[PDB]
Amino acid sequence: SVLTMFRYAGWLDRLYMLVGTLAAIIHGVALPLMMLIFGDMTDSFASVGQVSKQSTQMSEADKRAMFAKLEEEMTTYAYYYTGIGAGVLIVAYIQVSFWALAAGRQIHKIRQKFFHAIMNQEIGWFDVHDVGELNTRLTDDVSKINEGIGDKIGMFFQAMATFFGGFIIGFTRGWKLTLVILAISPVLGLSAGIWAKILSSFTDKELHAYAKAGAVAEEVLAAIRTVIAFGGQKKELERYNNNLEEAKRLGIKKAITANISMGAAFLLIYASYALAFWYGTSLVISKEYSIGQVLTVFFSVCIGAFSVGQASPNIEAFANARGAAYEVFKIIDNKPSIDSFSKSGHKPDNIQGNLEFKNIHFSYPSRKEVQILKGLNLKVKSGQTVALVGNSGGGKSTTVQLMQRLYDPLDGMVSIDGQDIRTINVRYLREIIGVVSQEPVLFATTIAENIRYGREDVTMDEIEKAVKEANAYDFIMKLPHQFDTLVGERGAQLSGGQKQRIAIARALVRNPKILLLDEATSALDTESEAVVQAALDKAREGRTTIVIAHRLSTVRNADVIAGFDGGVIVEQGNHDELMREKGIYFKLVMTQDVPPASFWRILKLNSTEWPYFVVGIFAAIINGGLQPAFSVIFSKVVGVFTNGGPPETQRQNSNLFSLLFLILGIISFITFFLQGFTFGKAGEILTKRLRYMVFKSMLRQDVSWFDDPKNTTGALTTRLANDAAQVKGATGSRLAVIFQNIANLGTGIIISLIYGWQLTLLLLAIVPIIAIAGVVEMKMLSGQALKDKKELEGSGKIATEAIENFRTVVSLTREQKFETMYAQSLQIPYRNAMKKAHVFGITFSFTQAMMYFSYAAAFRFGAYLVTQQLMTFENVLLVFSAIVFGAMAVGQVSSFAPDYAKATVSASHIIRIIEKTPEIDSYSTQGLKPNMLEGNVQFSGVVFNYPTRPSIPVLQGLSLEVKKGQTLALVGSSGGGKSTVVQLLERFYDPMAGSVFLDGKEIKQLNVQWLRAQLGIVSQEPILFDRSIAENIAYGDNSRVVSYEEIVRAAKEANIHQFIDSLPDKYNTRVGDKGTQLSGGQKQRIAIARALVRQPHILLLDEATSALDTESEKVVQEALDKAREGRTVIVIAHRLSTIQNADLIVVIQNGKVKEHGTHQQLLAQKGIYFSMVSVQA
C-alpha cells in the first residue's frame, strides 16, 4: 500500500527510526541556528568594519577596544560554532546509522520472506507466470526498496526540520523579506512531486526492461549447448540487445530529465539570490534591516526551501522504492490454495496403499481450454503394481502430478484409503510419495547431497543401500571423489542413464509408500533395466507403484495394466487378460588480482563518444571554475555593506551584482545541463556497450567454460547484471564531480590566495584531514566488496536452482532446505551491511562536523588577521567561502571512493571476460569451408577426457566409419561414450589424441560454424525455449527466416503436426520454460522437427524416440526412411527396434568398439548384441 512499507520493523527498528528521526530533526535544526550565529557575527563584525569612516580619528584605545572587543565577541562566537560541531557529530551518526540499521534489519527480513512466498506458490502459479524474472526481482527490486527506506528517509526529515527551522528563524528575524523568498518555495515543492513521479515511473519502466533482459540472458545461458549447436549466438545476442536498447533509451531520457530538474534547481537558487539581494535596499534605509540580519534570514529561508527541493531525489528514491515494492509485496500477499507450508491437515498414522481416482476431470491452468482428463477412473490396491500405457499426451504424467497434489482437479475425487487428499496435509502427503519424473533433474551439488535431498536425515549406509538398489553403486565407486563428485547444473556432467539412476536412489532413500515412476528406465540399457526392475520387485510388498513406461519389458510383470485413450481408462487388466483383448496394448505388443587502472580501461571504451568526453569536460571545468567565482560575488555583495560607507556611494548603484547572479544562473543551464547530459548519456551508452560485449563474449566461450562449477546459470546472470550495474553506479554524476570538484577546489587555490593568503593555509590542513577520513573507510572496508561480490553470486545460485527447478523441489519437499541455504548465504552480506552502516554513519558525521569546526577555526583565525590589520571581512569571507566548501567538495570526492573501488573490482572482471579468447572460437570466420560435402564421417583413434574429470578416460582410441546414405547405430551400456562422440562431431570439445574426419578433411580445419551448420542434432534431453511452438521449430536454421510451410512440413515429418493443429492457438502456442508445458513425447517430436527443418546432411539422434510411443516412433522412422538417401544418420537408442534396420550397428562400451557388423551378423554370433536381444524379449 502506502504505509505498509514498514510491516516487519519490530520494536528494534521502530526505535531506530524514532530516535533516528529525532536526531535527523536536531541535525536539520542546526543549520537555522548556524545562520543565526552567522548573521549575528556578520552584523557584530561589520561594527568594526567601515572603521575606515573616521579612520584618521584614533583614540587608539577606542580602536584597540574596537578590535579587542571584536575578538572578545568573536571568541564567544567560535565557542557556539564548536558546540554545534560537537553536537552534530553525535546526531548525524544517529541520523544515518540508525536508519540504515532499520533498513538493513527489514530488507534482510523482506528477502527471507520474499523467498518464502516464491517457494510457497503453487505449480500453476509457476506455470502461468514467467518465473525467470523472479531472480532479477529478488536481486535488484528488493535493492530498490533498500535504497528508499534507508538513510535517505533520514535525510528527508532533516530537510523538513531545516524548512521548519527556516520558517522559525525567518519569522523571528524578518517579517517582509521572508515571504519574498517564499515565492519560489511552492514552485520548488510542486516540481519536487512532479519530477519525482516522472522519475519513479521511468524507474519502473527501466526495471521492467532490465528484468526482461535478465530473463532473456537466463534463458539463453541455461540451454547454451542447444544455442551453440544450432548457431543461435547472433539471434540471442540481438534479443538481448533489444532489451538493452529499450532500457538505454529510457536511461538517456532519465538522465536528461534528472539533469534538467537539477539545472532548474540551480536556476532557482540563482534567482533566489538575485531576488533576495534585490530588496537589499532595506540596508540603505536605516534600521529596517541589518546586513547580518539580511544574510541570516535569506540563508535560513534558502537552505530550508532548497533542502526540501534537494530532498526530491530522496523522495524520488522513496518514490523509486514505491515504484518497485509492489511485485515484491504482491507475491508475498498472494496466498496459494495448495499451501505446502500450511500446518493444517490430517496426518494419518497407518496408511494402506489404496489409491482411488473417481471421475477425474483436469485442465492445466496455462491451457485451460483443453481437457486433459475427462472422467478418469483408477483403482490401486495395496501391494500392487499398476502400469499406465497409452499414446503420448494421454495424461499419464498428468495422473502422476495429480497424485502428488501438484494441481487440484477441476472436478473429481483423488483419495488414499478413502480419504480426501485435500484434507490430508500437503507436505505430509508428499513425504510418503517418492517420485521419479520423466526426465529426472539433479542439482548443482555432489551425488551424495543430491541423494540426501530425498531425506535430509539419511545415513551413508542407507545411501549406499539405495544406490545398490538403483544399480548406481558401480559407476559411483568407479570415478574419483566417489559420492563427493560434483555433477553439473541439472545433472549435466553425467550420462543420461547415470542421471536417471541417481534420481531413482533419491526417491528410494525416502522409503516411500507411493512410488510414482514416470519412464524411469528410458535412458537405461537392457542390463541396468533388469537390475532396477529386480530391485524394485524385491521390495514390492512394502509399497504400491504407479509405473509409466513405453517399453514393454517393465510392464509385462505388472499386477494390472491401465490403457489411456483420450483421458480415460479404456482397458484395465493383467498382461494375460489384455493379450487376448485385441486392444491398444495388443497393438503395442505387436509393434515391439584487480589492477588499479581497471576503471580507466572501461572509460576507454567511450573513445567513439570522445566529443561527449571533451565538451563535457570543458563544461565541468567551467561549472567548477565558477563556483569559486560565486564566492567572489557573494563577498562583494557582503562587502558593499560591511566595508561600504555613504549610501550614495555604491549601495543602490551596486545593483550590477544581481545582474551577475542572473547571468551565472543562465550559465548554470548552459554548463550544468551539458555536463550532466554528456555524462548521463555516455554513461548509458557505455553500460549498454559493456553488457553487449560481456554477453557476446559469454556466448563466444567453449562448452568447457560452462562446465566449470563457478559458471552456473544463476552465477552467470548475477555476474552479468551486477558488474555493469556497479560500473554504471560509478559512471555519470559521480564521474562529473571529479572533473568539477577538483576544479572547484583548484580555482579557489588561486583566487583565495590573491585576496588573503594567511587564512588559505588552513586549507593545507583541512583537505588532508577530510581526506584521511575516506581512507580509514576505504582501508577498513577494502576487501568486503570482494566478499560481497562472490557471495552475491552464491545466493543467486540457490535462488536460480530453486526457482528454475521448482517442480523437483516441491516433489521432494525441499523448499525449507532451500530457504535455509538462502538465509545462510545471505548472512555474510547482512553482516557486511550492518558493519558498513556504522562506518558510513561515522564518516558522514565527521565530514559534516568538520564543516562546523571549520566555521569556528576560519572565522576565529581571520579575526586575528583583522586584529593585525591584514585582512577585512570581504577577504576573510571570500577565502572562507572558497576554501571551506572546496574542502567539503573533496570530502564528497573522498566519500564516494567506495563506489570507485566497487567499479574497479567490477571493471577488472568485465575487461577480463571481454578479452577472453575461446580455444574453439565460434565467431571466427578463419576456416576452410568446403563447397561440396559428401557426408563421410570418420573417427580414427579418438581419445577424449572431459575437462571437469580429466583423470577419467572416456574414449580409448575409438575408430568408426559412416558413409553417405548409411545408418550407423551406437549401442552399449550407460556411460559407454555414445553421447560423447555426438558431442565430438559438433566440436563441443577437441579430442586429445585421435582424429575426426569429415569428407576426408579433419574437422579441426573446417570452420566451426560451417561444420555445425550441416549437423542436425537431437539431444538425449531435448530442451526447448520459452517461445512459440513454431519458433522452436524455426530455430533449426538461424541463418535464414523459415517459412511457415517449411515448419509445417517439418512438423508433419516429426509426427507432431496433428497435435499442434488440434491444439488451440495452433503453432503460436507458447510452451513453458525448457518445454515443461509439453509431454516428453511432444517435446521430443518438436525437437525432431527443429532438427529436420534444417534439412541436415548429418542427422545425429541421441535417443530421439525415447519418450515416443510405438505408433509415433513408427511414423517418425518411416518418415526418416523415406529420406534415407542424401544424408548420413548416426542414431543412439536403447530399444532394439530402431537399431534393427540400421546399415551398421556398433557396441560402444568402455570407449571401444567391440561388436561390429549389421543386425543379422551380430545377432547370429553370440555376444553382447545377442546379450541385449535375449533379455529384451
Ligand SMILES: C[C@@H]1NC(=O)c2csc(n2)[C@H](CSSc2ccc([N+](=O)[O-])cc2[N+](=O)[O-])NC(=O)c2csc(n2)[C@H](C)NC(=O)c2csc1n2
Ligand atoms: C558552493 C558553495 N557552498 C555550498 O554549496 C554549501 C555546502 S554547505 C552550505 N553551502 C551551507 C548551507 S547547505 S547547502 C547544500 C548543498 C548541497 C546539498 N546536497 O547534498 O545536494 C545539500 C546542502 N544542504 O546541507 O542543504 N551554506 C553555508 O554554509 C554558507 C554560509 S555563508 C556561505 N555559505 C557563503 C558565504 N555563501 C555562499 O553563498 C557560497 C559561496 S560558495 C558556496 N556558497
Ligand SMILES: CC(C)CCC[C@@H](C)[C@H]1CC[C@H]2[C@@H]3CC=C4C[C@@H](OC(=O)CCC(=O)O)CC[C@]4(C)[C@H]3CC[C@]12C
Ligand atoms: C557517536 C556515538 C558516541 C553515539 C552513540 C553510539 C551508539 C548509538 C552505537 C555505538 C555502538 C552501536 C551498536 C553496535 C552494534 C550493534 C549490533 C547490531 O546487531 C546486528 O547486526 C543485528 C542483530 C541484532 O541486533 O540482534 C545492532 C546494532 C548495535 C546494537 C549498535 C546500536 C547502536 C550503538 C550502541
Ligand SMILES: *SC[C@@H]1NC(=O)c2csc(n2)[C@H](C)NC(=O)c2csc(n2)[C@H](C)NC(=O)c2csc1n2
Ligand atoms: S540558499 C540555498 C542553498 N544554496 C547555496 O547556499 C549556494 C550558494 S552557491 C551554490 N549553492 C552553488 C552554485 N551550488 C552548488 O554547488 C550545488 C550543487 S548541488 C546543489 N547546489 C543542489 C541543487 N542544491 C542544494 O542541495 C541546496 C540546499 S540549500 C542550498 N542549496
Ligand SMILES: Nc1ncnc2c1ncn2[C@@H]1O[C@H](COP(=O)(O)OP(=O)(O)OP(=O)(O)O)[C@@H](O)[C@H]1O
Ligand atoms: N505444464 C503443462 N501446462 C500445460 N499443458 C501441459 C502441461 N504438461 C502437460 N501438458 C499437456 O497435457 C497433455 C498430456 O501431457 P502429459 O505430460 O500428461 O502426457 P504423458 O502421457 O505423460 O506423455 P509422454 O508419454 O509423452 O511422457 C498434453 O497435451 C500436454 O501438452
Ligand SMILES: Nc1ncnc2c1ncn2[C@@H]1O[C@H](COP(=O)(O)OP(=O)(O)OP(=O)(O)O)[C@@H](O)[C@H]1O
Ligand atoms: N559434461 C561432462 N563432464 C564430465 N563427464 C561427463 C560429461 N558428460 C558425460 N560425462 C561422463 O562421461 C561418461 C560417458 O557419458 P556419455 O554421455 O558419453 O554416455 P552415453 O553412452 O551417452 O550414455 P547413456 O546410454 O546413459 O545415454 C560417463 O562417465 C559420464 O558421467
Ligand SMILES: [Mg+2]
Ligand atoms: Mg509425460
Ligand SMILES: [Mg+2]
Ligand atoms: Mg547419453
